[PDB]
RNA sequence: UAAUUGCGAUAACGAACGAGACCUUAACCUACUAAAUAGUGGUGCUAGCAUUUGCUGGUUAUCCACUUCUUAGAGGGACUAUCGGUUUCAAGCCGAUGGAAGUUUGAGGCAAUAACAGGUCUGUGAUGCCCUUAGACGUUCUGGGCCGCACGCGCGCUACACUGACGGAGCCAGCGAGUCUAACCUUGGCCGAGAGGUCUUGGUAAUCUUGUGAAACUCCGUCGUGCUGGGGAUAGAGCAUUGUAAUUAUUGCUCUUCAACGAGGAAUUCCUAGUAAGCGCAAGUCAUCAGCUUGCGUUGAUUACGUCCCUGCCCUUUGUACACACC
């Protein structure tokens, strides 16, 4: 076996799992390159980690991610979290601490919750309205 | 609002009354204390009590 | 029904000679030049690009954008 | 359900639920121990089923 | 036989609801207080908790 | 597609099936200002008449126009589904017609008449000027006639 | 035209019957050493910069 | 290098595979094209007219390449959209099983998909071959 | 910029811009400065972003609204009038086209021009409905910076929306149009007019 | 303070119900126990492309290993913590750092005393009294009616388009539910424009339907501001489905007909964050029928973070000839 870690990233209900082993430098999502992804407007949102931390860093590693659940935007945020959390998970086990804490440093700095799973969730609708807060309509008489 | 109920503050009162040696300005050890030293039915109630005996401790120290 | 649905030869040469000084050209800018509806105006955008004048600096549907040649 | 038997009042709704928990444990044994372990370990409320075979 | 696990468990509950009724009526002048039904191999067992088992 | 040219070859407005058709519109939609010819029937007919939907009603050879007329009023001959036709299974000779232009009015009348003349409740109700299709009339439709 | 720039220094409270106006003591930045009290329209905190349009005129209460 | 179709953006691939299936001249287009409407949840027939059957054949191809097996119904539910029930709310509705089934037969007869076990239609080895090929072709245009 | 590649390759200007400057869609975040004292601290610009889309929790505290990147505040306030609630991808792309268009006319960082229009439209003072006894006069009030930014955004988008409604120009052409005329106040823009009016009335009741 | 929540003042001291605690659900565990009904890495068997290793798939058992993702048992975790402002330096409140989480953590379950001539005898084989009881007000069968249409009022659905309709193409959820002495959820294969038909099939279910390939949405075109290709009422004709039965048209499909509505007077409802709004789905109901409801996830703002002006209500003080309590 080779050196490798696995991670995940989660926005709403999209969970994005990432395998980060040692290799020649692929960055594949589901089964296609990261240069597709589309959304497209949100393309750079998944490029973001690789450019925040220098593109080179991915030259001794292979990166695969697969996404289930969530919606279109939900998944794009779930994958970018899993790629960056993965990059720091491999430096945490294989390269040194000061490099891991420099990646966490340039991530957390700019950020967008690249390492930190956003905790927003849907609030339950309750009886009397079509939404959770939104009550229906009265007219009195 | 985070106004502690009477039971919290009353229990904190009796604890510091009779166990001031032991306890500290540290919640985490006061918490473990409240386990081995009182009989609280719930984790949450015990953390509230302990976190409050800790506040009274931290501010008894300056008067 | 208020005109701009064909080509009238003079309109062609009008288009050829009026598209400098257009920092902006798109479907709306062609229409606003008192001519071509949004059908044939898009053809004008595909064909003024056949060679010259318009530099495509924008992409797609609804929104088009071109600038003068250099 | 609607809380009311009739129809008057605000339209308060009330929701009931029953929780069904299912486990399965796979064991390889002879006949004796199976029959010993299933005639005992009886419990009112726990629904026990003991299947066999590979199909 | 052969009924889904959900329908089974509800059906078991209704079986208790109906048994608790019938006893609550049929054993009133004997202080009927409740039932429990234990399922076993061979038998299905019903235990009548009442305050007067000489009349039961 | 392509910048075109042409000369005085297209004349605006042109009258077919006793109605008038504006030029300068994309021909497929121009035949819809004729009665009994919607966007589907128009489409299929211009597809079947060997015409370029890209063209406007403006151009089109007189040959093309006449072929269009021919196909519209003879749909089953030029292989058109019959489930594509508004007046299937007539009600007397049982053939499949596609009633067109000033004729759809007549058949609405003829059909309505038939129900009234039979005294059938749909007739009665068309005679009273109400809603036939069974919809509640208490609340809806009040401006009306 | 004369623009006067004044830095919020203290928050005094809500005015207006409805309670959305806020009374504020401001120290204009071009030559300090002089305070005026103005009334705001939007949300305000300490150390903001209000564009007083007429430099000498203050108000107090609001109905 | 090496290549799959998973290496090509969806639209320039399918556009390419369409123009190829076009060029080809081998295909089989039942006949009721141009008169048909792809879904009872639709308003106008396709605007490609002389074509689109290639586009959906390419579309169906790439879809069956991407996974184990897919039947006529999965393609119906896939190619089904939102039907405006006029004045009533929208609803999801499935598209035509004739169009898709006749596509699966005109691509199986052209050996690019094959009745699979378990069920549905599986991508053909010869299809893998030719899809990966034109995929490579489509990237080659971007050089 | 020293190109680098690995297995799945990453494009030219993609690598180039990214690892170098941390700029927008592809526009400059350095330079561009708020040409007015105040409004700073309430117009973002730095830290820079790629595209105006963020899972930001700018709401669960009073003023944190002010630390949101300003362009995204513009984009956010695009996606309204019931039909376009949500639909931020729609808004984001409109903004991209809009910045491209503004850039076409009169050069300038189009993001800078945006900053210019936002500054130039916040009303320096307004009026409020005082009681004062039934017949209510109008008290002139000096409005906050934050309310000046907010009202600027809502003004420019809304007047751009009324102007794009029912005519051939697209939302991005009219948004750009409003951001162009309002960048340097020309009173041919819905925003400048309304700002000038709120100040005229506020002056006239002081 | 959300709270008779507390501090404090104190002829009161110390307490109990109720609030809080508690319970349920949504958040965090590369720590613990495990999983061919969940999934991952390796290995074979094998396809495709490049060939220099490589990339992308197939294979309910061909084996080995793991438990990050998924499942739910047991724990842990937050106590508004650390620091600093503010406050009688009190309870508390505010800001920053940290943190899965710092608005009662978010959302609910539960919930004292007392009141109402609120509603329900049309849920009950719960019931007093009255009425009726064979030319029945019992019950059943046939048919009609609850849908009837000058018009007033309330909940709603669809729209007036170009942040759009249409057409190709992209392609992503979560809460559910499903057949025994029966015909429920249904993949797949053919046939059919469709709606549907038909031959088989899996599933009493984390195993099959189902990854519920949902819809908004994304992309490339066509249309070009024209009641227009926005809008889809009204209506004619034809095909199907549930049912013993579809006429006053159960629903579904196809063609055609192509209304009002060009943003809505005075008025008035709901709402503060994954909320509002936009979007669809599942469940109830259901032989057939959702423009309804109950939940669910998808996309995801603007604006406050205040006040007592309007309204509604609680609290004291005060008057009382009321106490069946201003009906
Ligand atoms: Mg919801
Ligand atoms: Mg017509
Ligand atoms: Mg779909
Ligand atoms: Mg589609
Ligand atoms: Mg309360
Ligand atoms: Mg090698
Ligand atoms: Mg090799
Ligand atoms: Mg685990
Ligand atoms: Mg923080
Ligand atoms: Mg809780
Ligand atoms: Mg009464
Ligand atoms: Mg009752
Ligand atoms: Mg009675
Ligand atoms: Mg009942
Ligand atoms: Mg009872
Ligand atoms: Mg009776
Ligand atoms: Mg009724
Ligand atoms: Mg009424
Ligand atoms: Mg109601
Ligand atoms: Mg579309
Ligand atoms: Mg047929
Ligand atoms: Mg079977
Ligand atoms: Mg699922
Ligand atoms: Mg009009
Ligand atoms: Mg339409
Ligand atoms: Mg009937
Ligand atoms: Mg009737
Ligand atoms: Mg029309
Ligand atoms: Mg309106
Ligand atoms: Mg019915
Ligand atoms: Mg239903
Ligand atoms: Mg109902
Ligand atoms: Mg007196
Ligand atoms: Mg008194």
Curated annotation (Swiss-Prot), chain A:
Question: Which UniProt keywords are present, listed alphabetically?
Answer: Acetylation, Cytoplasm, Isopeptide bond, Phosphoprotein, Ribonucleoprotein, Ribosomal protein, Ubl conjugation
From the UniProt entry, list the residue stretches annotated as the region Disordered: 121-141
InterPro entries on file? Ribosomal_Su5_D2-typ_SF, Ribosomal_uS9, Ribosomal_uS9_CS, Ribsml_uS5_D2-typ_fold_subgr
GO biological process terms on file? maturation of SSU-rRNA from tricistronic rRNA transcript (SSU-rRNA, 5.8S rRNA, LSU-rRNA); translational initiation
| Bias-annotated ranges (Basic residues) | 132-141
Alphabetized GO MF terms: RNA binding; structural constituent of ribosome
In chain numbering, cross-link Glycyl lysine isopeptide (Lys-Gly) (interchain with G-Cter in ubiquitin) is at 28, 45, 57
Phosphoserine modification, residue list: 32, 59, 74
Q: For the modification Phosphothreonine, which residues carry it?
A: 68
Matching SUPFAM superfamilies: Ribosomal protein S5 domain 2-like
Q: Which GO terms describe its cellular component?
A: 90S preribosome; cytosol; cytosolic small ribosomal subunit
Q: Where in the cell is it found?
A: Cytoplasm
- Subunit composition? Component of the small ribosomal subunit (SSU). Mature yeast ribosomes consist of a small (40S) and a large (60S) subunit. The 40S small subunit contains 1 molecule of ribosomal RNA (18S rRNA) and 33 different proteins (encoded by 57 genes). The large 60S subunit contains 3 rRNA molecules (25S, 5.8S and 5S rRNA) and 46 different proteins (encoded by 81 genes).
Q: What protein family does this chain belong to? A: Belongs to the universal ribosomal protein uS9 family.
Additional info? Present with 33800 molecules/cell in log phase SD medium. There are 2 genes for uS9 in yeast.
**Protein name listed in UniProt:** Small ribosomal subunit protein uS9A
| Biological source species | Saccharomyces cerevisiae (strain ATCC 204508 / S288c)
Species lineage: Eukaryota, Fungi, Dikarya, Ascomycota, Saccharomycotina
The record's gene field reads RPS16A
Swiss-Prot record, chain B:
Highest taxon above the source species: Eukaryota
* Compartment(s) where it occurs, according to its Swiss-Prot or TrEMBL record: Cytoplasm
Say what the protein does: Component of the ribosome, a large ribonucleoprotein complex responsible for the synthesis of proteins in the cell. The small ribosomal subunit (SSU) binds messenger RNAs (mRNAs) and translates the encoded message by selecting cognate aminoacyl-transfer RNA (tRNA) molecules. The large subunit (LSU) contains the ribosomal catalytic site termed the peptidyl transferase center (PTC), which catalyzes the formation of peptide bonds, thereby polymerizing the amino acids delivered by tRNAs into a polypeptide chain.
User: Which proteins does it associate with, and in what oligomeric form?
Assistant: Component of the small ribosomal subunit (SSU). Mature yeast ribosomes consist of a small (40S) and a large (60S) subunit. The 40S small subunit contains 1 molecule of ribosomal RNA (18S rRNA) and 33 different proteins (encoded by 57 genes). The large 60S subunit contains 3 rRNA molecules (25S, 5.8S and 5S rRNA) and 46 different proteins (encoded by 81 genes).
Per the similarity annotation, which family is this? Belongs to the eukaryotic ribosomal protein eS17 family.
What other comment is given for this protein?
Present with 30900 molecules/cell in log phase SD medium. There are 2 genes for eS17 in yeast.
The protein here is known as Small ribosomal subunit protein eS17A
Which gene is this protein's source? RPS17A
Swiss-Prot record, chain G:
Q: Does the keyword Ligase apply?
A: no
Q: What is its main location?
A: cytoplasm
User: Any idea what this protein is called?
Assistant: Small ribosomal subunit protein eS28A
- Outline the subunit composition: Component of the small ribosomal subunit (SSU). Mature yeast ribosomes consist of a small (40S) and a large (60S) subunit. The 40S small subunit contains 1 molecule of ribosomal RNA (18S rRNA) and 33 different proteins (encoded by 57 genes). The large 60S subunit contains 3 rRNA molecules (25S, 5.8S and 5S rRNA) and 46 different proteins (encoded by 81 genes).
Q: Where in the cell is it found?
A: Cytoplasm
Name the domain of life this protein comes from: Eukaryota
GO terms for cellular component = cytosol; cytosolic small ribosomal subunit
Q: Which organism is it from?
A: Saccharomyces cerevisiae (strain ATCC 204508 / S288c)
UniProtKB/Swiss-Prot annotation, chain I:
Keyword set, alphabetical order: Acetylation, Cytoplasm, Isopeptide bond, Phosphoprotein, Ribonucleoprotein, Ribosomal protein, Ubl conjugation
| Subunit annotation | Component of the small ribosomal subunit (SSU). Mature yeast ribosomes consist of a small (40S) and a large (60S) subunit. The 40S small subunit contains 1 molecule of ribosomal RNA (18S rRNA) and 33 different proteins (encoded by 57 genes). The large 60S subunit contains 3 rRNA molecules (25S, 5.8S and 5S rRNA) and 46 different proteins (encoded by 81 genes).
- Cite the GO molecular-function annotations of the record: mRNA binding; rRNA binding; structural constituent of ribosome
Q: What Gene Ontology terms for biological process does this UniProt record contain?
A: cytoplasmic translation; maturation of SSU-rRNA; regulation of translational fidelity; ribosomal small subunit assembly; ribosomal subunit export from nucleus; translation
Query: What family is this protein classified in?
Result: Belongs to the universal ribosomal protein uS7 family.
Phosphothreonine-modified residues are: 8
Stored InterPro entries: Ribosomal_uS7, Ribosomal_uS7_CS, Ribosomal_uS7_dom, Ribosomal_uS7_dom_sf, Ribosomal_uS7_euk/arc
Q: Which PROSITE patterns match?
A: RIBOSOMAL_S7
Is this entry keyworded Cytoplasm? yes
Q: Where is this cross-link: Glycyl lysine isopeptide (Lys-Gly) (interchain with G-Cter in ubiquitin)?
A: 26, 184
Q: Which is a Gene Ontology cellular component entry for this protein?
A: cytosol
Give the chief site where it resides: cytoplasm
Modifications made to the protein after synthesis: N-terminally acetylated by acetyltransferase NatA.
What lineage is this protein's organism placed in?
A: Eukaryota, Fungi, Dikarya, Ascomycota, Saccharomycotina
Protein localization: Cytoplasm
The record's section on PANTHER family has: RIBOSOMAL PROTEIN S7
Q: Which SUPFAM superfamilies match?
A: Ribosomal protein S7
Protein's name according to its UniProt entry: Small ribosomal subunit protein uS7
